[PDB]
Design a protein around this ligand. Structure first.
Ligand SMILES: [Cl-]
Ligand SMILES: [Cl-]
Ligand SMILES: [Cl-]
Ligand SMILES: [Zn+2]
Ligand SMILES: [Zn+2]
Length: 124
């Protein structure tokens, strides 16, 4: 199976890093590991991205930058500001997806209404 530095290098130098990691995952590749898991009560709000850990009973909380493909690849973030929504914050990941937090944040979107991940916690 492939190791973290090899996966990250391959994606970092690709012209589309996100597509590289998604295509790697779809081929059965081993997810990036060593994301920073938090110890927390699991009685939090369940919001997706928060100032302190907010996992509910169905989620795990992680340090945000460790779960961000662009931070882990040390590359610019996609947007004219290059701003990262995860760095410095805590991200809640459904526990069924906690084996691949980088893939989860890459693939998913936060509901602008309820603040939870669309398709998972969001009940809108
Ligand atoms: Cl490696
Ligand atoms: Cl450990
Ligand atoms: Cl969720
Ligand atoms: Zn980032
Ligand atoms: Zn919602």
């Amino acid at each position: 199976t492939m190791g973290n530095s090899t996966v990250l290098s391959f994606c970092a130098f690709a012209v589309d890093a996100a597509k590289a990691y998604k295509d790697y995952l779809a081929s059965g590749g081993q997810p990036i590991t060593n994301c920073v898991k938090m110890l927390c009560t699991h009685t939090g709000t369940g919001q997706a991205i928060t100032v302190t850990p907010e996992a509910n009973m169905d989620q795990e909380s992680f340090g945000g930058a460790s779960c961000c493909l662009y931070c882990r690849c040390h590359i610019d973030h996609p947007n004219p500001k290059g701003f990262c929504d995860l760095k410095g914050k805590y991200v809640q990941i459904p526990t069924t997806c906690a084996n691949d937090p980088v893939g989860f944040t890459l693939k998913n979107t936060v509901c602008t209404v309820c603040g939870m991940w669309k398709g998972y916690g969001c009940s809108c």
